[PDB]
Amino acid sequence: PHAPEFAFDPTDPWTETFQRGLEIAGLGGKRVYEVGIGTGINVAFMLQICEAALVSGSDLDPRLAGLAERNVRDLAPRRADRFHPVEGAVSLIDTPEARAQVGRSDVIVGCLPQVGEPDDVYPWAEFDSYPFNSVGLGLNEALLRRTRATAPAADVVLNFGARVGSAVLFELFEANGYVPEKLHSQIVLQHAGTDISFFVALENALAQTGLEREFTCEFYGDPEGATRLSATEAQALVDTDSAAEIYHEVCVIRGRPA
Amino acid sequence: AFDPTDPWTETFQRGLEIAGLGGKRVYEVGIGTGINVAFMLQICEAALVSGSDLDPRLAGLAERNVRDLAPRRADRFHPVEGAVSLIDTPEARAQVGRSDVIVGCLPQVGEPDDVRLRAFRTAQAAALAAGADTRDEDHIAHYYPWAEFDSYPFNSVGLGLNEALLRRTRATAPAADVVLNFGARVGSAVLFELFEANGYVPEKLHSQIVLQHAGTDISFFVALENALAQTGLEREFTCEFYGDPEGATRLSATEAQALVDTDSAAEIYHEVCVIRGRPA
Amino acid sequence: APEFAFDPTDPWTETFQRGLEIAGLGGKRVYEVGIGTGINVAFMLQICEAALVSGSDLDPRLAGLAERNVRDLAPRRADRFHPVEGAVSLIDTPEARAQVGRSDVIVGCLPQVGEPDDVRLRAFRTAQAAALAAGYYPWAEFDSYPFNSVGLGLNEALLRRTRATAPAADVVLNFGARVGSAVLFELFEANGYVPEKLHSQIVLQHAGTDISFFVALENALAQTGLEREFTCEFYGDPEGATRLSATEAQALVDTDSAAEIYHEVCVIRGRPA
């Protein structure tokens, strides 16, 4: 009954949105696998604040597993005995060990590369064929094919920019064997350098049939998400003013198998 | 007996009879006013029928409707309330998971151009028969969306919504049959691949030659005939139309549109068929 | 297993057969999609020591010609070969599904973009000849597959069938690797299979081979309409020391004609979880 505000990072609104969803997910007592553990701070968060029973994970970069280990031992010293990462270079979960560990997990979590992520920030062309790569989420769909096969009973909890709308995000789960549920969302502001052509091209794109398409992306003018904008609209306000403040939603969605 | 003004629905119903729904639990996606619910209950002798529609005002009407249509069996009709897109609600999924068979005539490119007008007139006919004098808008609606089904592989032949329902059925009812109605202009091979690609063995249960209204646009199907493949290599493809009500003289989409570029009332036919998908 | 057994006339089939031997089919019950004239059946019974080989073909005449070829080439094993009859597209008959569902391993060298340009004329001449004795896959229904974007749509269509009909069976497939192994592996990972590359060779491509489809791959913009980095894998030498894009390969030949262009063929096994 006391929100752990001190815990969520004050720096990155994407990671903050993720961590708040992880807290809501209810990871207490579960085995959890994180795709792309990075520096390990999410693992530390899930161990210390969420109270996961066990956490494993992997990264594409082999040096990151070892560095994640220090961090977890520094930041969650009295819970670090429960962090068992998988070394070494692991794209998605594509090694036998990563597969074994995913196979034993109750929840798979991640914030994966996706069109629309922040610039500041996997191999990439082999995911181009995925149907949901048409909205920039191929890599995310690639993981859902793997999780459904290796751990068919586990939840999958993923972080998304929601410029394409929640009907599409929910579709990515429904198309792949999972009932989706939005755990948490937030309005976030994007850098002034962010490119969004991709998003204007989306609403200007003919279907695929192809016939029609009066669809519109989701942006906001205020940090409260009061004033909706299309991608074209938004793209305008920046042609008007290069330092115009543009907002979109980031949200955490859990897919639960049947 | 069947209404011959709506051949897609005749086709649908005739297909359902053949399905073998005697004593089974069935879910219908898009129950409408319950015409198909009552049919299965009265003619097919189903033990239980449930289902939903994306218009939330419809279940109530249907219920009523089925009561009047099959009162001696309307107690086995158990609709699910709410604005149910496909089977997207816990309660909807729950019922689907308990069903032996899932049936639908779903939106799809090539459905009759007047399908949304017929539904509006059927909704308002059913409310008048229930003793209510209403506002017309009570029977209109903004359903079904389309953008989230656009990325589906089989949306390229206009069946994205149908594919999406198959992703759903397979996961929440992996042993259930799925019985679906389609316009076959794209070819029965393509219709069969829709099922095969999604874990189902297809069987064509019944089919019929029907005529398309004169003002029906078929440039979509023409556009498929001139398209290249995903490869960018030449694609060989032909749509299936007919010049005769019997389905004896075949026409591609390009030919069919020629006969209405020269004349303007040339009778143009195509197939409508019921396909059952059965999992292994 | 002796060198003489592997096909000395055809690098694609030689690659397939070296890969099947490495798959360890001994004692297994196997199913081949596209048996053709049955030589691979003979190779799997006689060299791989399979307990039982079934399979089918789209051309309904080939199962009968494959029986005679297996009777004449592995007479001591011929009783272990039980082809499925009739025209069979992939495995799409109740008898082919029933056999596939009893199989330990499903194998195939399936039609695919990048196959040798003369394979369809071979199969045609090969029919006719073998047809005495005495007396193709369309590609339109498979065009929707995501992996058709790389020309592997028929292969993906099989993976959807095997997974449903024989969920515990391995699946062993021969591929040209011009689109790279990450893509080939992703075809399996996307469809419920863990890929392992069993064997691979560097083959020479016929002289007038059209590689325009692969050039186009290197210049396409993805599904998102933005940039994409991608090079097909070709080689200038028969050991693959010197790499080449499809564009480099095409250019090497625009200025020659008889330039030697090489690429990889490789056998991948897809194992369920």
Numbering used by the authors:
A (entry chain B): 11 to 131, 160 to 296
B (entry chain A): 17 to 296
C (entry chain C): 13 to 147, 159 to 296
Provide excerpts from the study:
MmtN is an S-adenosyl-methionine (SAM)-dependent methyltransferase family enzyme. MmtN catalyzes the S-methylation of Met, in which the methyl group of SAM is transferred to the Met molecule to generate SMM. Recently, diverse marine Actinobacteria, α- and γ-proteobacteria were shown to initiate DMSP synthesis via the methionine (Met) S-methyltransferase enzyme (MmtN), generating S-methyl-Met (SMM). We propose that MmtN uses the proximity and desolvation mechanism for Met S-methylation with two adjacent MmtN monomers comprising the Met binding site.
The best diffraction data was generated using a MmtN K141A/K143A/K146A triple variant from which the crystal structure was solved to 2.5 Å resolution by the single-wavelength anomalous dispersion (SAD) method using a selenomethionine derivative (Se-derivative). Importantly, this MmtN triple variant retained SAM-dependent Met S-methyltransferase activity, exhibiting no substantial difference to the wild-type MmtN enzyme (the specific activities of MmtN and its triple variant were 51.2 ± 1.3 U mmol–1 and 47.3 ± 4.5 U mmol–1, respectively). MmtN crystals belong to a P212121 space group, with three molecules arranged as a trimer in the asymmetric unit. Each MmtN monomer, which is composed of six β-strands and eleven α-helices, consists of a cap domain and a Rossmann-like domain42,43. The MmtN trimer is assembled through interfaces between adjacent monomers, and contains an ion at its center. Ion chromatography measurements implied that the ion in MmtN was a phosphate ion (PO43-), consistent with the result of PO43- detection analysis using the PiColorLock reagent kit (Expedeon, UK). A PO43- is located and likely bound, through electrostatic interactions, to a positively charged ion-binding pocket comprising residues Pro169 and Arg183 in region V of the MmtN monomers. Pro169 and Arg183 are strictly conserved in MmtN, but not in other deposited SAM-dependent methyltransferase structures, suggesting that this ion-binding pocket is unique to MmtN. Therefore, the ion-binding pocket is essential to stabilize the trimer MmtN structure. In the MmtN trimer structure, loop, helixα7, helixα9, and helixα10 of one monomer generate an unclosed hole, and loop of an adjacent MmtN monomer pops out from the Rossmann-like domain to insert into the unclosed hole, resembling a gate latch and bolt pattern.
